[PDB]
């Protein structure tokens, strides 16, 4: 019973007191006192914000927000591509106990309206690139009182820039050294409102508390579960800051004093040059970029000798792709994490000294996990596939103003049901099979796209893959694949089909065929768009 529940270990050291704003303040202040430390670096522009500058900006903005009239448990929003200024309003709000609602900068107007109607922010911090769409929607949304432009040094058309907002609402002689963030009940006060559709339904707002965040801050500094690079090391992330994957990794990087090199769009040459030129030792990727590291000839053109911590998350990573990356970079293994918006951050992480190729790691401190039978709901033992469920101190407070949806994902016993199929081995390493809804319904079988995608990615001419079921009169769904070929290489549909058939049981064959495409349709955290795949595989 409880014999089959898997528990994270003790944290290496106990949880630090204080709110997430108090812990961020202490960390920014520490690094600001060491000469030359840099917090944020824009790979496209080479512009930096130092830890000293970030401390100044976040404290001055917090004071400005208080004088503007914001109180604890008011809400602001941030709608912006990854840039140097994104986290200035995030951290300032956490200082004063104002909830932060990051909003996808690529949202349509209708998606924007639906997200903002949940969080109802009083102020929206936008970028030059999102200003127009935020202006459009604001006309319909009475609760928005103020727009602030993050990355302009001048006001635009009646809308104020960040620097002029701070100048208006704080005294120029404001003493940063004495500023103190607010103390409040970290178990109750919401820190972030993040967008997630969850296991079913329309997009919702996930409430994460300051307690959820400081538990993440415990993990990221933990000698076993944390990043294995020392303060001041350069780390390069390609993950959108408005998603939990990018939000709670990047916030943790500040507490570690890393130099965070960011991009607002991925470009292969700039990515590699940036790893080389900033002597990057750690990088945070999605599986498509792991395949790039494993297979691209471009990698050999750059000096990547400093890179030693290569991390993936967001979607299933093929065992063989991870092994190929580790081999090519002469590393003992790769780093991986698994989590959901609803669990704040990764709740399974590859621990220091403990790698198992194909496994996304072990349960983190302050968490427990179980695997439940899809039919009975009974708890399963090792090497038995079922739905992964989790309990621990980063589980969300719930969905904003949606207790019904909250109860559908967190059961009456307190377990969050992830919607993912997986298993754990005799040593506690967890393996993610696929999202339950992604399984292909071929007759009475359930075939996992990630299993077929992993085989496809074993082929030396295949650099990306996406598998789904296409509709079929007789069988319901036929497994079918979109394949991206390495430039200069050639494969026929028949070659790909036979390659897979030689390795899989009859039910898993690509009876729906293969299409060759220039890119797999995937989201910004690696989620494969199965509907987009079907549209290609029907045409
Ligand atoms: N490793 C994985 N293997 C297979 N499937 C995966 C994996 N990770 C996610 N999923 C799928 O993603 C679905 C949730 O999707 P979401 O709610 O949009 O949130 C998210 O993805 C974000 C929420 S924090 C998170 C992470 N923080 C870290 C920190 C370090 C690191 O080194 C890696 C990571 S990853 N992920 C979930 O249910 C699966 O189906």
CATH architecture of the largest domain: 3-Layer(aba) Sandwich
Radius of gyration: 23 Å
- Count of extended strands: 27
The CATH top-level class label of the largest domain: Alpha Beta
Structural class estimated from helices and strands: alpha/beta
Strand order of the largest sheet: 3-2-12-11-13-14-15-16-17
- Tally of separate domains: 4
Helix content: 25-40%
User: Could you tell me how far the N terminus lies from the C terminus, measured between alpha carbons in angstroms?
Assistant: 50 Å
Q: Might you state the CATH topology name of the largest domain?
A: Rossmann fold
What ligands are attached or bound here?
Answer: ligand D4F
Q: How many individual helices? A: 15
Q: How large a portion of the residues is in β-strands, by DSSP E?
A: 15-25%
Characterize the largest beta sheet: strand count, sense, and whether it forms a barrel. Answer: 9 strands, mixed
The general outline is globular
PDB class: oxidoreductase
Keywords: Luciferase, Bioluminescence, Ancestral protein, Molecular evolution, oxidoreductase
Assembly: monomeric
Entry title: Ancestral luciferase AncLamp in complex with ATP and D-luciferin
Can you put this structure into words, describing what you see?
This protein has 539 residues and is of the alpha/beta class. The protein folds into four domains: 92 residues, Luciferase, domain 3 (Roll); 181 residues, Rossmann fold, CATH 3.40.50; 159 residues, Rossmann fold; 106 residues, no CATH class. It has 15 helices and 27 strands. The chain has a nine-stranded mixed sheet with strand order 3-2-12-11-13-14-15-16-17. Helix 2 packs across helix 3 and helix 10 packs across helix 11. The structure holds the ligand Nc1ncnc2c1ncn2[C@@H]1O[C@H](COP(=O)(O)OC(=O)[C@H]2CSC(c3nc4ccc(O)cc4s3)=N2)[C@@H](O)[C@H]1O. It is classed as oxidoreductase. Keywords: Luciferase, Bioluminescence, Ancestral protein, Molecular evolution, oxidoreductase. The assembly is monomeric.
């Amino acid at each position: 019973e409880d014999k089959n529940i898997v528990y994270g270990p003790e944290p290496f050291y106990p949880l630090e007191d204080g709110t997430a704003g108090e812990q961020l303040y202490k960390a920014l202040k520490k690094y600001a006192q060491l000469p030359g430390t840099i917090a944020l670096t824009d790979a496209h522009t080479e512009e930096n914000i130092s830890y000293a500058e970030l401390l100044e900006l976040t404290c001055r903005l917090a004071e400005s927000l208080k004088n503007y009239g914001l109180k604890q448990n008011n809400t602001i929003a941030v709608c912006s591509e990854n840039n140097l200024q994104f986290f200035i309003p995030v951290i300032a709000a956490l200082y004063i106990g104002v909830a932060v609602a990051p909003v996808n900068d690529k949202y349509t107007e209708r998606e924007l309206i639906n997200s903002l109607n949940i969080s109802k922010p009083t102020i929206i911090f936008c970028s030059k690139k999102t200003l127009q769409k935020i202006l459009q929607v604001k006309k319909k949304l009475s609760y928005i009182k103020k727009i602030i432009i993050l990355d302009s040094k001048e006001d635009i058309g009646g809308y104020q820039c960040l620097n002029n907002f701070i100048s208006q609402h704080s005294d120029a002689n404001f003493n940063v050294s004495n500023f103190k963030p607010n103390s409040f009940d970290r178990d109750e006060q919401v820190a972030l409102i993040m967008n997630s559709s969850g296991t079913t339904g329309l997009p919702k707002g996930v409430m994460l508390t300051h307690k959820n965040l400081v538990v993440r801050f415990s993990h990221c500094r933990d000698p076993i579960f944390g990043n294995q690079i020392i303060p001041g090391t350069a780390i390069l992330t390609v993950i959108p800051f408005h998603h939990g994957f990018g939000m709670f990794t990047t916030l943790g990087y500040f507490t570690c004093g890393f130099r965070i090199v960011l991009m607002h769009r991925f470009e292969e040459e700039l990515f590699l040059k940036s790893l080389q030129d900033y002597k990057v030792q750690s990088t945070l990727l999605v599986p498509t970029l792991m395949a790039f590291f494993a297979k691209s000839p471009l990698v050999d053109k750059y000096d990547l000798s400093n890179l030693k911590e290569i991390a993936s998350g967001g979607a299933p990573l093929s065992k063989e792709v991870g092994e190929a990356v580790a081999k090519r970079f002469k590393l003992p293994g790769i780093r991986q994490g698994y989590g959901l918006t609803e669990t704040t951050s990764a709740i399974i992480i590859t621990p220091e000294g403990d790698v198992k190729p194909g496994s996304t790691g072990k349960v983190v401190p302050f968490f427990s996990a179980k695997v439940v039978d899809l039919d009975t709901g009974k708890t399963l033992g090792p090497n038995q596939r079922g739905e992964l469920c989790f309990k621990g101190d980063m589980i969300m407070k719930g969905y904003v103003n949606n207790p019904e949806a909250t109860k559908e994902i967190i059961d009456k016993d307190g377990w969050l049901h992830s919607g993912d199929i997986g298993y754990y081995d005799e040593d506690g390493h967890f393996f993610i099979v696929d999202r339950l809804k992604s399984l292909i319904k071929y007759k009475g079988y359930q075939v996992a796209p990630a299993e077929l995608e992993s085989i496809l990615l074993q082929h030396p001419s295949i650099i990306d893959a996406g598998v789904t079921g296409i509709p079929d009169e007789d069988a319901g769904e036929l497994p079918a694949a979109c394949v991206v070929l390495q430039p200069g290489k050639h494969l026929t549909e028949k070659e790909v089909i036979d390659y897979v058939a030689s390795q899989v049981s009859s039910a898993k064959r690509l009876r729906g065929g293969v299409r060759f495409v220039d890119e797999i349709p995937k989201g910004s955290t690696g989620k494969i768009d199965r509907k987009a795949l079907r549209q290609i595989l029907q045409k």
